[PDB]
């Protein structure tokens, strides 16, 4: 059966500014089947209050989801998204680069 790897982008809703509230986003797209595991990490640990968009899919039938959480960025805190899916042998971790 058809299996497509998720593309992953990790980024903020607004241009990141220390001390200003924002949303950290992990966008997963182009994947099949739809079961995926997506966590947001703050300094290496799973963030607990993380929501997601309703499962939908593109013209070629592949799925996409946005995972998101309110945060306030600081100079030192690191953020990342960690994804597991049938196409990945081990969890893929993408770090947040306040420049991507």
């Amino acid at each position: 059966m058809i299996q497509r790897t998720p593309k992953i982008q990790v980024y903020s809703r607004h241009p990141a500014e220390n001390g200003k509230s924002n949303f950290l986003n992990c966008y997963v797209s182009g994947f099949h089947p739809s079961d995926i595991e997506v966590d947001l990490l703050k300094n290496g640990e799973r963030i607990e209050k993380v929501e997601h968009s309703d499962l939908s899919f593109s013209k070629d039938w592949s799925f996409y989801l946005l995972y998101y959480t309110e945060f306030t960025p600081t100079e030192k805190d690191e953020y990342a998204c960690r994804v597991n899916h049938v196409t990945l042998s081990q969890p893929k971790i993408v770090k947040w680069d306040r420049d991507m």
Partner: protein, 275 residues
């Protein structure tokens, strides 16, 4: 301009763990407006855009009834497809369904769709004439024949050409602030050094709606297609979209490069330069 309405349905079997997971979503252009999730506590079709929240209990009760009827037909479909493909009871499988309509810039019916995929691949699709079916698999022919004999296309034609576009127009009018708006891209560039002899110039487009956008780079006005890194347009989470495009610019050459942005929200396409 031109508009669309689409509904998207995903049903996933979960052998040994209960009924299939069923999710429906509806969109007008790039704006989600309804959802149903079979795992949620409400068991109702739910609003996801503010303009649909004032539709009232006849709407919500009837859309809850219709969407549950769609859940049940996919529940049966999973069992039907498993039989057709001689598949075991153990494995999880996926049916997806999409239907809907486009209107043109006159707001008249332009195109309609109704199509299914099984486990990520085209299963059956209504053709553009809304009168015939495209079916690639052998298993899919059984469905095509069943549908030709039950005149499913005729029923679908009447919906897509009538109800579907009438309700799209109602939504366009009722959500005119949301749906008939454009948000122009807010743009900028960043510059970051790879090494001493080259740097990455990234052109950003933020907060734009709708999602369709063209972002390119040129070098002395020649298109840099092969040498541009382009990422997929992504949601900001607030109903707007984001995209970027980057080139590697060797030293002293920033002035050669222009980033070109086309978007319905712009009064004229932009030409940006690092300078």
């Amino acid at each position: 301009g031109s508009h669309s309405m689409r509904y998207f349905f995903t049903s996933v079997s979960r052998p040994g763990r209960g009924e299939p997971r069923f999710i429906a979503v509806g969109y007008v252009d790039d704006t989600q407006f309804v959802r149903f999730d079979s795992d949620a506590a409400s068991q109702r079709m739910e609003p996801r855009a503010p303009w649909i929240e004032q539709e009232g209990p006849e709407y919500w009760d009837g859309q809850t009834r219709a969407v549950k009827a769609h859940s049940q037909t996919h529940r049966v479909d999973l069992g039907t497809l498993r039989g057709y493909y001689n598949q075991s009871e153990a494995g999880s499988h996926t049916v997806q369904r999409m239907y809907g309509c486009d209107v043109g810039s006159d707001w008249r019916f332009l195109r309609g769709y109704h199509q299914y995929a099984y486990d990520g691949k085209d299963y059956i699709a209504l053709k553009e004439d809304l009168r015939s079916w495209t079916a690639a698999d052998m298993a899919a022919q059984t469905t095509k024949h069943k549908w030709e004999a039950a005149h499913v296309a005729e029923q679908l034609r009447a919906y897509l050409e009538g109800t579907c576009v009438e309700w799209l127009r109602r939504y366009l009018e009722n959500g005119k602030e949301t749906l008939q708006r454009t948000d122009a891209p807010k743009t900028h560039m960043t510059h970051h050094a790879v090494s001493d002899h080259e740097a990455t110039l990234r052109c950003w487009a933020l907060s734009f709606y709708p999602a369709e956008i063209t972002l390119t780079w040129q070098r002395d006005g020649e298109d840099q297609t092969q040498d541009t890194e382009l990422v997929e347009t992504r949601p900001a989470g607030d109903g707007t979209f984001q995209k970027w495009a980057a080139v590697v610019v060797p030293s002293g050459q920033e002035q050669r490069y222009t980033c070109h942005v086309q978007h319905e929200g712009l009064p004229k396409p932009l030409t940006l330069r690092w300078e």
